[PDB]
Design an enzyme around this catalytic site. Structure first.
Site, mmCIF file in Angstrom:
data_model
loop_
_atom_site.group_PDB
_atom_site.id
_atom_site.type_symbol
_atom_site.label_atom_id
_atom_site.label_comp_id
_atom_site.label_asym_id
_atom_site.label_seq_id
_atom_site.Cartn_x
_atom_site.Cartn_y
_atom_site.Cartn_z
ATOM 1 N N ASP A 66 0.942 -1.442 -0.084
ATOM 2 C CA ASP A 66 -0.058 0.104 -0.118
ATOM 3 C C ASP A 66 0.865 1.247 0.089
ATOM 4 O OD1 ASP A 66 0.307 0.880 2.991
ATOM 5 O OD2 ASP A 66 -0.279 -1.155 3.258
ATOM 6 N N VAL A 76 12.922 2.972 7.088
ATOM 7 C CA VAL A 76 11.732 3.007 6.953
ATOM 8 C C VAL A 76 11.101 2.039 7.956
ATOM 9 C CG1 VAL A 76 9.738 3.219 5.039
ATOM 10 C CG2 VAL A 76 12.277 2.739 4.285
ATOM 11 N N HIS A 79 4.399 3.892 8.877
ATOM 12 C CA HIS A 79 3.679 5.077 8.100
ATOM 13 C C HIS A 79 2.110 5.135 8.695
ATOM 14 C CE1 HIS A 79 0.820 3.628 4.826
ATOM 15 N NE2 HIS A 79 1.480 2.337 5.316
ATOM 16 N N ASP A 90 -4.918 6.164 11.310
ATOM 17 C CA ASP A 90 -4.571 4.496 10.814
ATOM 18 C C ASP A 90 -3.043 4.470 10.529
ATOM 19 O OD1 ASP A 90 -7.399 4.033 11.424
ATOM 20 O OD2 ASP A 90 -7.854 4.652 9.447
ATOM 21 N N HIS A 92 0.804 1.550 10.234
ATOM 22 C CA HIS A 92 1.264 0.120 9.719
ATOM 23 C C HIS A 92 2.465 0.008 10.476
ATOM 24 C CE1 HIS A 92 -2.031 -0.487 6.709
ATOM 25 N NE2 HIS A 92 -2.371 -1.159 7.599
ATOM 26 N N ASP A 95 6.057 -5.584 10.401
ATOM 27 C CA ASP A 95 6.314 -6.789 11.089
ATOM 28 C C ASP A 95 7.799 -7.337 10.969
ATOM 29 O OD1 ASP A 95 3.969 -8.152 12.670
ATOM 30 O OD2 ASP A 95 5.328 -9.671 11.867
ATOM 31 N N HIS A 114 5.355 8.376 17.846
ATOM 32 C CA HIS A 114 5.723 9.126 16.891
ATOM 33 C C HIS A 114 4.326 8.736 15.572
ATOM 34 C CE1 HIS A 114 7.941 11.399 13.596
ATOM 35 N NE2 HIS A 114 7.189 10.602 12.897
ATOM 36 N N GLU A 115 4.037 7.732 15.554
ATOM 37 C CA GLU A 115 2.865 7.403 14.664
ATOM 38 C C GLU A 115 1.525 7.954 15.351
ATOM 39 O OE1 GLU A 115 3.627 6.021 11.536
ATOM 40 O OE2 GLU A 115 5.374 6.697 12.682
ATOM 41 N N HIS A 118 1.320 11.547 14.624
ATOM 42 C CA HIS A 118 0.761 11.451 13.167
ATOM 43 C C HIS A 118 -0.630 11.661 13.253
ATOM 44 C CE1 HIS A 118 4.480 12.306 10.941
ATOM 45 N NE2 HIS A 118 4.920 11.158 11.271
ATOM 46 N N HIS A 124 5.552 16.571 10.700
ATOM 47 C CA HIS A 124 7.072 16.546 11.104
ATOM 48 C C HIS A 124 7.341 17.706 11.791
ATOM 49 C CE1 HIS A 124 7.833 13.004 8.270
ATOM 50 N NE2 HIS A 124 7.379 12.335 9.440
#
Ligand SMILES: N#Cc1ccc(-c2ccc(OCCC(=O)NO)cc2)cc1
Ligand SMILES: [Ca+2]
Ligand SMILES: [Ca+2]
Ligand SMILES: [Zn+2]
Ligand SMILES: [Zn+2]
EC number: 3.4.24.17
Length: 161
Positions: A66, A76, A79, A90, A92, A95, A114-115, A118, A124
């Site tokens: 996605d 990374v 997000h 929402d 992710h 894993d 941090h997520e 967001h 940021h």
């Protein structure tokens, strides 16, 4: 003071986990990140499982088509979304990675916070002490973990004056 569609109460649902560490590492991380903003701003939240809460924290294995496929121990880490009618709050998590709580690799406690920042409605920041800094800052000194005027103004714009 202008939060998600003017709603003071947001619900969050845990739909993610960790294959490397216990469930306290993921569940408590989501709540600590979620409530870390509760400890800073007068926001109200509830943790449930029904089907889809305001904020949905889900896991993302290598089949992450996605946005970006699995990169392993790559920069990374995750997000999230916030200003949307559906993707409101929402996120992710990769894993396929070493999710830790002691900066021993991919600190999910720091990443989740941090997520959550967001998804609550923030992007940021610029200060190195800011929880919303756009660059990995895994600090072993968990005693210096705090919020700064930089990110403070961001969350203040959401739930403050
Ligand atoms: N104090 C402190 C502090 C601690 C950690 C970070 C930190 C770590 C990884 C990050 O990775 C995820 C990528 C992203 O930006 N996603 O939306 C971003 C931010 C920053 C400041
Ligand atoms: Ca990664
Ligand atoms: Ca949502
Ligand atoms: Zn995704
Ligand atoms: Zn970010």
């Amino acid at each position: 003071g202008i939060p998600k569609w003017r709603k003071t109460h947001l619900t969050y649902r845990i739909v993610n986990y960790t294959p490397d560490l216990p469930k306290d590492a993921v569940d408590s991380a989501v709540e600590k990140a979620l409530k870390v903003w509760e400890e800073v701003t007068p926001l109200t939240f509830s943790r449930l499982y029904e089907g889809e809460a305001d904020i949905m924290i889900s896991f993302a294995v290598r089949e992450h088509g996605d946005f970006y496929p699995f990169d392993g121990p790559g920069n990374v880490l995750a997000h999230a979304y916030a200003p949307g009618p559906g993707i409101n709050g929402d996120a992710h998590f990769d894993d396929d990675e070493q999710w830790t709580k002691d900066t021993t690799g991919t600190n999910l406690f720091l990443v989740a916070a941090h997520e959550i920042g967001h998804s609550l409605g923030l992007f940021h920041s610029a200060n190195t002490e800011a929880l919303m800094y756009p660059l990995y800052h895994s600090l072993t000194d968990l005693t210096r973990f705090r919020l700064s005027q930089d990110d403070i103004n961001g969350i203040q714009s959401l739930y403050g004056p």
